[model samples]
Target: GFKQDIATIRGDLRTYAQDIFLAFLNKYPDERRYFKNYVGKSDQELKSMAKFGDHTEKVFNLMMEVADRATDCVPLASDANTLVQMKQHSSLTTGNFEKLFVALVEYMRASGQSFDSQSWDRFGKNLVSALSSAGMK
Candidate 1:
């Protein structure tokens, strides 16, 4: 029943992630299409897409909260900056990542649904595994 909803949301998130990444390059005048070509997005395109802006706003806001909670990381300058860092190496610990994950889930719960702990744990374990493999702190 909710599987479809989750699928749709996840799909939007994928695009939102990439578009926000491209938006970062748009912010830096010196980058000069470095990330734009990589992400294949323009600001106007992102703004116009349904679900794009809203999802981006929510995710970016949640990520900021996460960064604020993280003892080692600083808050990103904008949604664009957060996306750019998504492609880079990070020192974010698994614990800190979990905080961000749960925060976002909690936000979503407030919006309309209950946060599923099992789903959260499944995703967190995979994320933690990846970070662990990369030697991130």
Candidate 2:
């Protein structure tokens, strides 16, 4: 079902993003301060932050399009930076992203979503390469 889910992911990406992002936050609440725009924001306030929403769409798109990795570069610097923030806010790194992957897989499973092996594999490979480029573990 994940393959078909990917086919329709664009239509519900925001919902998916919100659930996944919040799950990550719930799992790592201390990381909240790293979100400069979203610090202290409620679930309702988070919905109105355009920058936060934009980040959400970009990431959900990134997840669904892992299968298309051969054709598109996807978001590298921007996405890696999306997970991290300003020089002042630079404490977070892409290593935090692997933590996100743990949340992601848990969310997918909890929501009864199945994996498309090819796409999941590409996603793992890309994360390793991308994080490696960012000087990650």
Candidate 3:
């Protein structure tokens, strides 16, 4: 059989997402049933979330709101801590991270449910404490 060069397929987002899911499966072969169930459940959640429109649109609206409040801009720099750094800055007075986190938290709180975050000392303390407890034998 002849081989076909397909390395560039990594640039496709849907293929990339599938590769991620497959990688997860490779790491936890015994969890296939759970993973399959998760994919279906996630699909439902994503469809419902898309009711607000495409994910990109939701993200664009978020960025527009943040841009209206601040002038400074910076791309994420850290490697291992990129997501944490992103979370800390996604906003106006703060990084893009904090701005969006706070906005979402506020929105959820207004709806009678609060989203947890490391934004405030109290929440951070509680989160760390919970994580520590969970990690204990």
Candidate 4:
């Protein structure tokens, strides 16, 4: 099911980008300040911008790569922890991560993709583990 869900989105990641971006922004405007330097435009404008599309694609693709690594039994915490440490989030917190994860699942459902509860829980646990390693907890 993971493979199939991945396959479903593989062809239309840009759509996924819009969904996640809007979902996150609408749900959390405070988080928008996190990208103040990179995105000075309104949330709607950011969704339309080429750079936004590019950035979303890159991030989500990286997420897919993470999922692939997980599938292969590769340790994701090592790399993910580094990613978290690279940023100094004075305001961002683990709650922000949950917002994004919520957007991800909502996007999947909107696109008619399905995920088993057990697998979803496992994935979420791994995500938290990786972020916790980044010192979020």
C-alpha RMSD for every candidate: 12.1, 4.8, 17.8, 3.3
By TM-score, rank the candidates, best first.
4, 2, 1, 3
Instruction: Name the TM-score of candidate 4.
Output: 0.74
Give each model's whole-structure lDDT: 0.46, 0.63, 0.31, 0.65
lDDT of model 3, residue 104: 35
lDDT of 2 by residue, 33-74 (tens): 676766677777887888877887877786666534333433
Tens digits of per-residue lDDT, candidate 1, 96-132, equal 5555455544444544444353554445454554555
Residue 76's lDDT within candidate 4 is: 78
**All candidates: TM-score:** 0.37, 0.64, 0.23, 0.74
How much lDDT does candidate 4 score?
0.65
- Sort every candidate by lDDT, greatest first: 4, 2, 1, 3
Which ten contiguous residues of candidate 4 have the minimum total lDDT? 112-121
lDDT of 1: 0.46
Worst ten in a row by lDDT for model 2: 66-75
Query: Which structure is stronger by TM-score: 1 or 3?
Result: 1
Q: Lowest-scoring 10 consecutive residues by lDDT in candidate 3? A: 1-10
Runs off by more than 4 Å, candidate 3: 1-52, 56-94, 114-137
Q: Which regions of candidate 1 are displaced past 4 Å?
A: 1-5, 10-87, 114-117
RMSD of 2: 4.8
